[PDB]
Amino acid sequence: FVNQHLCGSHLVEALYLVCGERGFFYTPKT
Amino acid sequence: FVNQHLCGSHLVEALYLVCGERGFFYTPKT
Amino acid sequence: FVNQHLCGSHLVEALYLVCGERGFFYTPKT
Amino acid sequence: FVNQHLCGSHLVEALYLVCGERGFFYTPKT
Amino acid sequence: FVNQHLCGSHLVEALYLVCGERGFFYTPKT
Amino acid sequence: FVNQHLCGSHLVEALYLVCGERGFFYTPKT
Amino acid sequence: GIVEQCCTSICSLYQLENYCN
Amino acid sequence: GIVEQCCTSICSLYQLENYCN
Amino acid sequence: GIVEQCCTSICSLYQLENYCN
Amino acid sequence: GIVEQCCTSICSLYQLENYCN
Amino acid sequence: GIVEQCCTSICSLYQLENYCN
Amino acid sequence: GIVEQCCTSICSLYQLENYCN
Numbered sequence A, B, C, D, E, F: 001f002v003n004q005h006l007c008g009s010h011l012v013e014a015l016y017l018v019c020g021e022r023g024f025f026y027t028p029k030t
Numbered sequence G, H, I, J, K, L: 001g002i003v004e005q006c007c008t009s010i011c012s013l014y015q016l017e018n019y020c021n
């Protein structure tokens, strides 16, 4: 039932771009 | 002379995958 | 000396995302 | 229930490539 | 009901990388 | 002077797509 | 109408060829 | 908490803007 | 003219915002 | 058979390691 | 020989079509 | 410093492994 592993990869790509070239952190946790 | 913007997008994809669903941070700086 | 073909592919991806599910046009010309 | 947002991103990539460096428009609507 | 086409695209990327610049094959069949 | 590693990644993506869900082999060698 | 034709079923190459300029 | 907010529903641009440094 | 403006220099977000419908 | 083993369940690294030349 | 033909010059579609099974 | 180490030369897997939490 894979889906969270590919779903987190669709956000990272649309995340660092939003910044433009500054930096960001990705920590998946409650 | 674009290249660093597309070069940092080839690493992020090959970075969160190494972890394996754990978490990581991306901060480009000296 | 490829570079414009891969350069136009790095923009399209960062283009439809900016819209946010609205629509856009890509016409490369002087 | 995300799926259409990631589904429209798998086509754009396989769309501008078909043209071959010519141009194309992406307008999702009925 | 697309899914296998985008599913085989998530593996190829995480396949040639495992090798490490050696070579590999992708033949989807029973 | 990286460039061949990222250049081989721009073809694999535009290679399996050409087939259309059939199969292909990637072996870089003279 | 690519979202209502390719997302539900990989459109053929000819059908997707009629979308380029 | 991006996995429990965007994976279940495309987060808005403003909500995703509060995640950048 | 995105190929002759962003490929030579990452266009700003505002300039790229004037390209969406 | 990677489509019928990794698509239904992320194959392990060892199993995917036996597919490289 | 795709690394020594497409990396130096985008190979044509026909040339890349002779590489599929 | 991944931009000044991998962008100039594919960093090794061990070097990139010391960047994960």
Ligand SMILES: [Zn+2]
Pocket (backbone or CB within 6 Å): B006, B010, C006, F006, F010
């Ligand atoms: Zn690239």
Ligand SMILES: [Zn+2]
Pocket (backbone or CB within 6 Å): A006, A010, D006, D010, E006, E010
């Ligand atoms: Zn995907």
